[PDB]
């Protein structure tokens, strides 16, 4: 007789601590090294692909980002590395990164008209247009906020209180316009010393403009610093102002708050469903690991930077 | 010669990478996974249990938190997740989380009356009460700060400097009151536009009230934003203010400085002693690991998020 062991023609090679290329009978690769290369629908719900648009541009209602006036439920938001259409008028949304962090937990917005334009009898609502935010070439302005301007050479003190009667949180956005100079300030608002006093159960904000000289980004030297808040059910926001007020018109109702992320990628969209997704491309696999990109979403394999994670399920 | 090995009657078992539930001869457990379920003394000194009280409510002296006027030395602070009494009049405490971070290193405060009520000849000291901070039904206010009000249709300028003659740091607490409208201020503080300037060797503040309309919390629409500082030996704090001043009365000598934590739990306290403590219960044990809770204080085992560790000290 004789005693021994099995052999075959397998060219499978394995790393070991004292030998880095060991021809084994069988081996189980535990690393997925391939992706579909195109964005897919995570569990049937298609993402919100802000094509050439940002979170700020979408939320404030950029005129060029008008494809997102109505947005169905999304599994994850997708944004490019450097969106072109983002705060068309110069400015900066305060706590932008915190707003994105909160948005990463939100799966649906139901935009509602909280302050109709008919709620401004003594101010102009149709002249708040700039060339920095054009629509179809002609001048325009953000769609979800109203730039209020003097009427009859006057700007009466705005005082409006909105009470949340819904059972859901409301993300309310406003802003303050920082004018070019004093003569521009009286040309737009007829008030040298203006303010915006916002009040809530938690928020106690006062905003004074900053009339100064700045640079020409997007052809304008005024800066609209936008602000946001989240208003709880049975909680009331109180706006008071006498100038520089970029008032709310539309506010997003947080109607479904689950899990999501703001994925950064310019990868194209394929009409395809998935279960794990990555910025480079979806992963349709069930191996323990993958080595495509650190950030993923969904029930995914774990990320390891190695190129060859193989486990010896054989001899030799 | 009959070479072999023994075998006991124990049914205990261990696990390995290729087999699990391997029956063994003798084995050593290294996970304690039991606790008394009661807050205990830590090396002889009882903790500070803030029952229905908060760190802000304790330090500011909430009228509903009266058992902490002469707190002795402790080792850790225990607080409920949502204390009932905290900032009874609505408002905020700036850098509250930093103050709690510093209290995590402080084992004893001795409150000293730094500014007696006789040091306010030209202002009211026994009228700054509210219904948001009741005591025995009648209205009251924080006892470690004094709300100052006009005496005879006048609020003279308040310029007081406190020099830290003590050999220990002093945690000095003050605040700014945010009124509702100009009428309310003129009722309370005769001066329409007011401020609070605060100066130290390493601090500079210029606080202005935010007279705005806000939601009614605890029946009150004003907001007391409290502020804190640590004053070193031979260092003096300079308070200037013509209104809206929630002045200091008691500061806090940091007599003993060591290791501590804020436990954030509401387990009932039993008269017991231990070397290690967790929020849910104490740990009297010499095991290398534990799994009761991540946050611990004292000479403790090392947390491991598991339920079964055992070393196969036996033959089989």
């Amino acid at each position: 007789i004789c005693i021994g062991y099995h052999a075959n023609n397998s060219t499978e090679q394995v790393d070991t601590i004292m030998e880095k290329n060991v021809t084994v009978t069988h081996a189980q690769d535990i690393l997925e090294k391939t992706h579909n290369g195109k964005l897919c629908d995570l569990n049937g719900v298609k993402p919100l692909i802000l094509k050439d648009c940002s979170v700020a541009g979408w939320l404030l209602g950029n005129p060029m980002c008008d494809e997102f006036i109505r947005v169905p439920e999304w599994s994850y938001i997708v944004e490019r590395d450097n969106p072109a259409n983002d705060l068309c008028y110069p400015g900066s949304l305060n706590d932008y990164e915190e707003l994105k962090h909160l948005l990463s937990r939100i799966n649906h917005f139901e935009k509602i008209l909280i302050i109709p334009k008919s709620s401004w009898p003594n101010h102009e609502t149709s002249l708040g247009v700039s060339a920095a935010c054009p629509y179809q070439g002609a001048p325009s302005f953000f769609r979800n906020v109203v730039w209020l301007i003097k009427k009859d050479d006057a700007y009466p003190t705005i005082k409006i209180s909105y009470n949340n009667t819904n059972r859901e949180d409301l993300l309310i956005l406003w802003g303050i316009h920082h004018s070019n100079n004093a003569e521009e300030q009286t040309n737009l608002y007829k008030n040298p010393t203006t303010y915006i006093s916002v009040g809530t159960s938690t928020l106690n904000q006062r905003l004074v403009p900053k009339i100064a000289t700045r640079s020409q980004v997007n052809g304008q030297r005024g800066r609209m610093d936008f602000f946001w808040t989240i208003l709880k059910p049975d909680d009331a926001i109180h706006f008071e102002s006498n100038g520089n007020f970029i008032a709310p018109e539309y506010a997003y109702k947080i109607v479904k708050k689950g899990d999501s992320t703001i994925m950064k990628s310019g990868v194209e969209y394929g009409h395809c469903n998935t279960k794990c997704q990555t910025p480079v491309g979806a992963i349709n696999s069930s191996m323990p690991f993958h080595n495509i990109h650190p950030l993923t979403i969904g029930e995914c394999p774990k990320y390891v930077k190695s190129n060859k994670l193989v486990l010896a399920t054989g001899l030799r | 010669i009959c070479i072999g090995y023994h075998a006991n009657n124990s049914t205990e078992q261990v696990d390995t990478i290729m087999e699990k539930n391997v029956t063994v001869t003798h084995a050593q457990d290294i996970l304690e996974k039991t606790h008394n379920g009661k807050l205990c003394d830590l090396n002889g000194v009882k903790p500070l249990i803030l029952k229905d009280c908060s760190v802000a409510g304790w330090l500011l002296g909430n009228p509903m938190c009266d058992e902490f006027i002469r707190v002795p030395e402790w080792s850790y602070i225990v607080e409920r997740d949502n204390p009932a009494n905290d900032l009874c009049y609505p408002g905020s405490l700036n850098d509250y989380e930093e103050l709690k971070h510093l209290l995590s290193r402080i084992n004893h405060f001795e409150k000293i009356l730094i500014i007696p009520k006789s040091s306010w000849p030209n202002h009211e000291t026994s009228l700054g009460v509210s219904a948001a901070c009741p005591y025995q039904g009648a209205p009251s206010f924080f006892r470690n700060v004094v709300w100052l009000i006009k005496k005879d249709d006048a609020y003279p300028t308040i310029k007081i400097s406190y020099n830290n003659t003590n050999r220990e740091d002093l945690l000095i607490l003050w605040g700014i009151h945010h009124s509702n409208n100009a009428e309310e201020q003129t009722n309370l503080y005769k001066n329409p536009t007011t401020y609070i300037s605060v100066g130290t060797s390493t601090l500079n503040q210029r606080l202005v009230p935010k007279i705005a309309t806000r939601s009614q919390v605890n029946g009150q629409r004003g907001r007391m934003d409290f502020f804190w500082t640590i004053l070193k030996p031979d260092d003096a704090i300079h308070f200037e203010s013509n209104g809206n001043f929630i002045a200091p009365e008691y500061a806090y000598k940091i007599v003993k400085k060591g290791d501590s934590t804020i436990m954030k739990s509401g387990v009932e306290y039993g008269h017991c002693n231990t070397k290690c403590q967790t929020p849910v219960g104490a740990i009297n044990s010499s095991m290398p690991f534990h799994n009761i809770h991540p946050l611990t204080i004292g000479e403790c085992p090392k947390y491991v998020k598991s339920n079964k560790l055992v070393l196969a000290t036996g033959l089989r």
């Epitope: 302050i115 209180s161 009470n163 | -």
Partner: antibody, heavy 122, light 111 residues
Framework: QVQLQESGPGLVKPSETLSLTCTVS????????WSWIRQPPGKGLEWIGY???????NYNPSLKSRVTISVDTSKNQFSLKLSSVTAADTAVYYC???????????????????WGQGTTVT | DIVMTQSPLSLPVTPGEPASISCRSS???????????LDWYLQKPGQSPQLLIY???DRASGIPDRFSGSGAGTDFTLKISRVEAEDVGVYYC?????????FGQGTRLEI
């Protein structure tokens, strides 16, 4: 530039129903509560009712039994229907825009800013 | 609320002199969101009533700067600093806190 104008007769019998109509031009009946007003010769202003643009109506408790207010957004008009005209109901009837819109959620207030030219009734 | 008592019934004052109309209430005129909810109106001899001031002291759109309100709670006062001609007319105080809106009694403000 919203302008309100009254319409209706002057002479009224002391037993039958009165009918006035107030027409608004420059903007539709869109977003505000619209209130009818009456002032006798001298004396002081008093208000009969006000109708929300939706249709919700609140009437004076003194005049609650006989009043009925309506609205017609298509025609940009709203009417008053005082029934059982007593000799007390001889006055000059004005027409104002309350401009409050104090609904369940949105609150603001601008007063009876725009007033129509009143119409006499006897 | 239901009763608005306007203290002068006819205020005599010459040109170039401050005037002070007053209007008490039988209830605290304070909305739940800290708004006074008083309105001062002027009725000229020919023209319909005109809004002068709303929400305590907030001037209306096309009104001169001489008019200014004051007061909180129940005691309220209109002030006419310049009292120039064409101010002749009956002044009213209205409460909009509750559904029974109530105007005050007139004050003629004789020139």
């Amino acid at each position: 530039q919203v302008q309100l104008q009254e319409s209706g007769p002057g002479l009224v019998k002391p037993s039958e129903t009165l009918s006035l109509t107030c027409t608004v031009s420059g903007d539709s009946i869109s977003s505000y509560y619209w209130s009818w007003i009456r002032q006798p010769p001298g004396k002081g202003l008093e208000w009969i009712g006000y109708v929300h643009y939706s249709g919700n109506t609140n009437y004076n408790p003194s005049l609650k039994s006989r009043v009925t207010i309506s609205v017609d957004t298509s025609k940009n008009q709203f009417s008053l229907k005082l029934s059982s005209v007593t000799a007390a109901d001889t006055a000059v009837y004005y027409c104002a825009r309350t401009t409050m819109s104090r609904g369940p959620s949105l609150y603001y207030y601008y007063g009876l800013d725009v007033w129509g030219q009143g119409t006499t009734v006897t | 609320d239901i009763v608005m008592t306007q203290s002068p019934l006819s205020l005599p004052v010459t040109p170039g002199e401050p005037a002070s109309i007053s209007c008490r209430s039988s209830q605290s005129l304070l909305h739940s969101y800290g708004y006074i909810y008083l309105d001062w109106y002027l009725q000229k001899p020919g023209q319909s009533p005109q809004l002068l001031i709303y929400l305590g002291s907030d001037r209306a759109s096309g009104i001169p700067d001489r008019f200014s309100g004051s007061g909180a709670g129940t005691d309220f006062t209109l002030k006419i600093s310049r009292v120039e001609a064409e101010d002749v007319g009956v002044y009213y105080c209205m409460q909009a806190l509750q559904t029974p809106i109530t105007f005050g009694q007139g004050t003629r403000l004789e020139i």
